[PDB]
Amino acid sequence: MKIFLDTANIDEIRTGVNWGIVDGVTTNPALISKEAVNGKKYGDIIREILKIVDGPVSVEVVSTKYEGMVEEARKIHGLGDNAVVKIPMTEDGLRAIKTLSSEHINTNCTLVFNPIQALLAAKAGVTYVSPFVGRLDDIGEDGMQIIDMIRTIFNNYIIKTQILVASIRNPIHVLRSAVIGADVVTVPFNVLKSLMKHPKTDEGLAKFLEDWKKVSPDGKLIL
Amino acid sequence: MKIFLDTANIDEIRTGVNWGIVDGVTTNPALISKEAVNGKKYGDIIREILKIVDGPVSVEVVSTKYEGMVEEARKIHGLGDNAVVKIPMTEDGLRAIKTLSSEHINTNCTLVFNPIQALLAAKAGVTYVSPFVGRLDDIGEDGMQIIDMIRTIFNNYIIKTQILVASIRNPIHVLRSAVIGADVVTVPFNVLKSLMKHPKTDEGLAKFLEDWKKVSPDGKLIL
Amino acid sequence: MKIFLDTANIDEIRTGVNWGIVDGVTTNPALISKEAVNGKKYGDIIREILKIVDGPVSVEVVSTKYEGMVEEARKIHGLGDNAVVKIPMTEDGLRAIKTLSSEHINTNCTLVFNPIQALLAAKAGVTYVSPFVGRLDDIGEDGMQIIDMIRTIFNNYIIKTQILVASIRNPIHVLRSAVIGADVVTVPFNVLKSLMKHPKTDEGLAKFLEDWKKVSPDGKLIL
Amino acid sequence: MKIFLDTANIDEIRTGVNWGIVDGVTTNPALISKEAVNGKKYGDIIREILKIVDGPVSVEVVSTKYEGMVEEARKIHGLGDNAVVKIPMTEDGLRAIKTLSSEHINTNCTLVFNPIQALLAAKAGVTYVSPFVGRLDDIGEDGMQIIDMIRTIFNNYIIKTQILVASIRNPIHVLRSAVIGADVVTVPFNVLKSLMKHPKTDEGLAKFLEDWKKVSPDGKLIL
Amino acid sequence: MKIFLDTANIDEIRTGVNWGIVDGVTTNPALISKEAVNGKKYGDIIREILKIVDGPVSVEVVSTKYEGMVEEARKIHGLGDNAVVKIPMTEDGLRAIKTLSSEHINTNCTLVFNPIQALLAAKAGVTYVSPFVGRLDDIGEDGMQIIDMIRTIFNNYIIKTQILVASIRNPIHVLRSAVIGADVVTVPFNVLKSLMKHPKTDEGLAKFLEDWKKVSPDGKLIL
Amino acid sequence: MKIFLDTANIDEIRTGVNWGIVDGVTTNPALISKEAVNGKKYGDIIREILKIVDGPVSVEVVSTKYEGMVEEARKIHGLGDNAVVKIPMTEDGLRAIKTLSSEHINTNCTLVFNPIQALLAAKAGVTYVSPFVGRLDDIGEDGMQIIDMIRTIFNNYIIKTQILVASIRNPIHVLRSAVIGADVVTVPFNVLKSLMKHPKTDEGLAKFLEDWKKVSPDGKLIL
Amino acid sequence: MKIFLDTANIDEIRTGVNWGIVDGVTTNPALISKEAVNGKKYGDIIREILKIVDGPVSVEVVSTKYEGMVEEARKIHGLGDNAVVKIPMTEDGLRAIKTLSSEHINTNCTLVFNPIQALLAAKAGVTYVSPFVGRLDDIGEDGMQIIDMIRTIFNNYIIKTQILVASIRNPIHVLRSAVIGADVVTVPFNVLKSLMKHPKTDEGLAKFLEDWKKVSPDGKLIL
Amino acid sequence: MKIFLDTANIDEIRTGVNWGIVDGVTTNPALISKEAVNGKKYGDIIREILKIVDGPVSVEVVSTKYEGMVEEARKIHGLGDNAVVKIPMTEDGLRAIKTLSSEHINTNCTLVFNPIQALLAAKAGVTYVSPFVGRLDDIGEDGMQIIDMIRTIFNNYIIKTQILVASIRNPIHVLRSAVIGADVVTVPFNVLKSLMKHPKTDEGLAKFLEDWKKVSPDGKLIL
Numbered sequence A, B, C, D, E, F, G, H: 001m002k003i004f005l006d007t008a009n010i011d012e013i014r015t016g017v018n019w020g021i022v023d024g025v026t027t028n029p030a031l032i033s034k035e036a037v038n039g040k041k042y043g044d045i046i047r048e049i050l051k052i053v054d055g056p057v058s059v060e061v062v063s064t065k066y067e068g069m070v071e072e073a074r075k076i077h078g079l080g081d082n083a084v085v086k087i088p089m090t091e092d093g094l095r096a097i098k099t100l101s102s103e104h105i106n107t108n109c110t111l112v113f114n115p116i117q118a119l120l121a122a123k124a125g126v127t128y129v130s131p132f133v134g135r136l137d138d139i140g141e142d143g144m145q146i147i148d149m150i151r152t153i154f155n156n157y158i159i160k161t162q163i164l165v166a167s168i169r170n171p172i173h174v175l176r177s178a179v180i181g182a183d184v185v186t187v188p189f190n191v192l193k194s195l196m197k198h199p200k201t202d203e204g205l206a207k208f209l210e211d212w213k214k215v216s217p218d219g220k221l222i223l
């Protein structure tokens, strides 16, 4: 399972990549506008992320019309080969995905909330589909159930579109995604950081360190 | 999963084709007779759909006897290579399917209501079998259970006939067909258009464009 | 399980009542406005339905504010003892239900789309809660799964609010509701009419008539 | 589980009643007309069965209209207190059932092929409902599944209508009805007699009989 | 769960009665004829078992005709109040069971090999029904599945007939009968003795013995 | 299922109670110190919450030693009859719960992370036990599974301690708690507010309002 | 679920009693012989535990013959009304249990390794039966499966013998016993103390007291 | 499944290796410091184990910083080709694993307590990942459930990191690991010794020896 960082915060992206545990980044217009404050331009932020991340970087078009979407998508693609064009699940979005796929531009269909939407995006040739589990949780349905059904549907038809679980809120979204077999999760930094941690890891490390002081006073392993 | 449009209405077909999510069309004598009013003739309707749709186009014979069905099927085949001959599940229909299969004329066995009917159609060599889920629902049995059994039976014997789910009434027939693994669904236009839609997609799109207005006055993505 | 008729059409209600299989009626503002055209007034439609139907008749308030809802609910209550006040699942609607319940005015909480909303309505003391299965089917979620969860939740806490399955589109919504154990279904007239019918009932009746003609050419039973 | 005999053949009924395992009888127009030959009249056949069978005896109306059904029902009732009036699942039949039940005349609703039909018959007050399992088997659906659903539905609502499994063709219909918990099965005579039999019973009897000739030559148990 | 001994050997019964774990006895013509050798008469054997065993003692008739079975059953009854008359699952056997039940003579229907035979014996009023699990195992059918189905059936109808698992061959027949909830098992003596034993029991005692030798060489518990 | 608000924010508590959907409040030392800023005293905050909430108000002791806990608990209890003393799952906490239970002071055992801790608290007589699902989610285990096991354990032993699900982060914790059958959930305000809402409720209300304008221009229900 | 301490060590018993979570004690000749060193005698140990523990205190006989066991059991009973006589699963042990049960001396059958042994002990009238889960684990079978079967068997027959899970090695034996519904677990002291503990309890407690220092310098709760 | 020995005790390792059932060894700082007492040095213990064991030997770094870990890991690697570097699940440990993996130095990520940590370690390229089942049992969570999830996750993504079950306490951890399909278990010596043994193996051997003595008083097989 690949793990993407769901942020436009450059410092978070740097730190996450410096852990070697981040395989790419997803952004969206909200996450970008959060960071485009106090003189920082959205265009510089996008170029900087594309520079520092070796893996895919998902960047969302803002136009709602087919022509504007394909035009913006070609510009996004021109910024670097790791750019992935994020495109909403709409009638025009699907048309744009089909055209862009034929042009060998990688695409990520976003704002997906049920398995049939996901299937339609795959039929259009989309590289990744992003169902939003947290926003489903918000409306009182277990979002992970939609991930499970997409995985089954994609398995049934040997679909090559990757399932990119998005709107992740907690480490159990991540655990359930991995057990289901989703291709990718995208996580906020706070969630990313918690995935490495466990209280018994902390405790066991402290105890081993104390045990070793009985045999080596300076805490080193001299071999 | 392939998605066909279940209509003889030219504008619905034109619209759904232009969306890029319609892989074919199914018709029947009722659908065609609805469009053959105020001047239009059934031959023009059939020829016009064949022209618009690159994928399979299923057209039903009207004869009930073997010889009439085979003669009408050859005339339907003559209209274009993408024509598929729809034939009812009857003794004469099965004989016709076996004859036409040997002539390499694609066939679609219709009016199928249980799994063993579907198996018999497959044994006669039919290209597609169309179980009617909505008409089973109407009589108080969950029509999707028949799709699940047909899928298992066809998997057991490596059967190459495609399951074409028909008499579809709502987007859950479509969801459950995909989870089962049916090869094709054919859907009325009203159903097809709903498949792309979800209120959270609409809410999330409107919110993203509002966020973007905080960094781009004219709502543009300049890169 | 009670079966209500989901219409404001007086001819449909008269017919279903005469069949003896209609235990009540649900209306909403869409249904009522469909009938109050070309002269007929909405207050007259409501009153005629109250007169015809011996069972509960659900009539929805139009105000969105607590004070207006309660005022409208009292005028609804005053039209006849079988009137039930239909109230939307909103903050003001919950407050209205709590007040009307304390006044021994029967209430029906509507526009419910997940099990926790249904629980909230039951906690406000609502007489009936109406989850909309067909509108969930429309957005790609199996609406009956919400009914199943509500039944389990209500069973857990011995809740007395009745589950009134609404937005019903087909006889399998009805079948599954009964298997789950929902208290009420409300159905449109074309669904109601299908519930009695089965092709093997029709076929068996015809056959038994022919059998009887052998021992009695007139077709009567003389005992 | 009560066990009824599904026949109008007086020799079969006598033979089966003579065994102590027959709790009642069901007839229908076909079963009666098969026996009403060679100067034998349907009225005598019915009266004879009523006299010989302590338990319920189900006798089917032939009128298809409400008023004719109620009039035939009362005449059937007048033939004996054990008579039960068999009435088809139609709009007129439901109306007739509701009238007869209020007159304390026992009823049996027949020609039932799905669970919601069975529920409607129970809601009209019918004493017994008879789903036809064999005729469902004939059309490619496992009829016993319908019994299972009706049992669950009736349990959910504490329904007092007895489930009378009809159109029984083999002893596995009977076994499955008992495991489900149906209240009654009605069986043809050939099925009835097979229910007592098993090859290991026969083989065991013969061995014990031979084992006993070792200790007692004449085959007696002198105590 | 009650536990009976399945034998006619007086020494086995005497030994098992000494243990306090045998609740009754079953015999059959094969078992009785094995002990009636070298001048021991079957009449003596039956009387001595009745005297030794406080609980039910099952003794099988030898006639196959109704009158003879009822006559023999009455002689058996007269031998002691704890006598239970064992009667085969046949047409005359069901008739005899019904007659004897009405005479308040306890009965045990034997040579039962499926659940419907067990149901029929229960409907005749039988006190105990004895399905033969070992003989089903012999013919390649898991005999315990029949016990499971009988338990479910008897539970569905609140049947008072006790399930007496017979033809037991090993301790797992016993374990599974207890997990199912059968009322009684009857076991051969070699099975009965095995039920108390387990190698970890034997090992644990020896070790506790050795431990106590450290504290008290005497081997006593002076309190 | 009772719903508590998990906050010490007086404005949130006022608003939640003014919806009639809040059955009590839980606090802890963190939530209280959040509000005890800029001249507001912790003691006034606790008294104010106890004043405005009619249901239970859980207030946590700060002492870690048994004597300090029982002393603080008696002071908390003295502030009002709705006060519940929140006590951590420690050796001294359990001793304090036992003493306080005998004094008829209601208690809430907090910081519970597995089902056996919950059982020990119930054995001590605790009124409520609070397992922390969100903090389990944080460490990579599905916290709701612990709620499920506690419910089963409590069911097994007819335990009267109420399960109070705490550390709730999202509406699916709430839905799963209700399906499991937990006695109480305690939720932050943001979660509380989301429980009432659904996009289809919003949409349906807007549509009904527009439909009614065709029949009543001023949007009122004049009866 | 009752929790007993499985030890003869006086200080462990004293400590666990003072915690309020120990409902009784089990001993065996090995546990006692461990404490009967450096002067202390087994009689003083047994008498001293009986004094400290209000609940049941199980004390094992050392004789292997019926008469010795019954005599030792009467002497154990004489030591206090809370004494329970532990007797192995052997033929003489079962006889002793039956005799002692009639004398109203409470008993505990030990060295039980499968469900049928437990059933036999229950049929002899034993107060508690102790299956050894840890010693089953040692030989490669999951000992908790035996507890689950015993629970089902005892439920089937409304058996009043309490299941006392023994040879417990870890807190998951305890968890699974509670989920199954065993009546009692007996645990070594090391296991008992771990049952109250969890790292997140420790982390959360330390964090709460840190938060409170921001509003109360001396860490006190003044109300 | 490979079986490693989890000890630094050279006498235990020698013994297990001589049995032929030990495929490798795991150590940690606690285990090593237990043996390096009263003269013996830690560097000598490690070297002797590397010499004795032909299979993998896991030796844990003591530094907590990336640079120190890699330096220590290289000195460990240099001691022999069978050395595996054990590295804790921390941010610096993941970085170290990634670096060492690129240097073709085999690694073992330790102190893993949930499936997502195990996934992270596999993504860093670790040779073996060691979840601690016994430490999870200690805190009241069934540690084997984490092994089951890791196996499923690893199967989903065709991950080549081997699952090395650690913190093993009993032979049922071993049994369940094999049923799940874990790649390796590492066991303490007292667990290892039990894996070969079963009381029925011992009993059957004794019996077969007695049987042979009948046909051969010396006890040999002369062929």
Ligand SMILES: *[C@@H](CO)[C@@H](O)[C@H](O)[C@H](O)COP(=O)(O)O
Pocket: A006, A026, A027, A028, A031, A058, A086, A108, A110, A111, A130, A132, A134, A135, A164, A166, A167, A168, A186
């Ligand atoms: C792009 C899709 O892969 C992502 O940035 C998604 O927009 C977010 O993951 C959605 O998350 P929120 O629901 O928190 O906006």
Ligand SMILES: *[C@@H](CO)[C@@H](O)[C@H](O)[C@H](O)COP(=O)(O)O
Pocket: B006, B026, B027, B028, B058, B086, B108, B110, B111, B130, B132, B134, B135, B164, B166, B167, B168, B186
């Ligand atoms: C041909 C078979 O695929 C289709 O046109 C079918 O006739 C329809 O799908 C049947 O649907 P209705 O039950 O709505 O006629």
Ligand SMILES: *[C@@H](CO)[C@@H](O)[C@H](O)[C@H](O)COP(=O)(O)O
Pocket: C006, C026, C027, C028, C030, C031, C058, C086, C108, C109, C110, C111, C130, C132, C134, C135, C166, C167, C168, C186
């Ligand atoms: C009132 C009970 O809430 C009913 O009239 C419901 O409004 C309808 O059943 C909703 O159905 P539609 O989704 O077809 O409007």
Ligand SMILES: *[C@@H](CO)[C@@H](O)[C@H](O)[C@H](O)COP(=O)(O)O
Pocket: D006, D026, D027, D028, D031, D058, D086, D108, D110, D111, D130, D132, D134, D135, D164, D165, D166, D167, D168, D186
């Ligand atoms: C009356 C209803 O219980 C019965 O006589 C039914 O008509 C028959 O059981 C129907 O059986 P067939 O399918 O064999 O007519």
Ligand SMILES: *[C@@H](CO)[C@@H](O)[C@H](O)[C@H](O)COP(=O)(O)O
Pocket: E006, E026, E027, E028, E058, E086, E108, E110, E111, E130, E132, E134, E135, E164, E166, E167, E168, E186
């Ligand atoms: C009487 C009925 O309970 C019993 O004695 C049975 O005949 C035997 O249990 C049958 O056993 P076999 O199959 O071993 O004869």
Ligand SMILES: *[C@@H](CO)[C@@H](O)[C@H](O)[C@H](O)COP(=O)(O)O
Pocket: F006, F026, F027, F028, F031, F058, F086, F108, F110, F111, F130, F132, F134, F135, F164, F166, F167, F168, F186
């Ligand atoms: C008291 C226990 O019922 C509550 O206030 C709990 O402390 C909180 O619910 C714990 O939640 P957090 O994990 O967010 O502190």
Ligand SMILES: *[C@@H](CO)[C@@H](O)[C@H](O)[C@H](O)COP(=O)(O)O
Pocket: G006, G026, G027, G028, G058, G086, G108, G110, G111, G130, G132, G134, G135, G164, G166, G167, G168, G186
């Ligand atoms: C008596 C029966 O409850 C207990 O003392 C048992 O002897 C022990 O629980 C057995 O445990 P070990 O297997 O550790 O001896």
Ligand SMILES: *[C@@H](CO)[C@@H](O)[C@H](O)[C@H](O)COP(=O)(O)O
Pocket: H006, H026, H027, H028, H030, H031, H058, H086, H108, H109, H110, H111, H130, H132, H134, H135, H166, H167, H168, H186
């Ligand atoms: C190394 C593999 O990670 C092993 O030595 C582990 O540290 C131990 O198996 C952990 O066991 P304990 O929980 O008994 O220390």
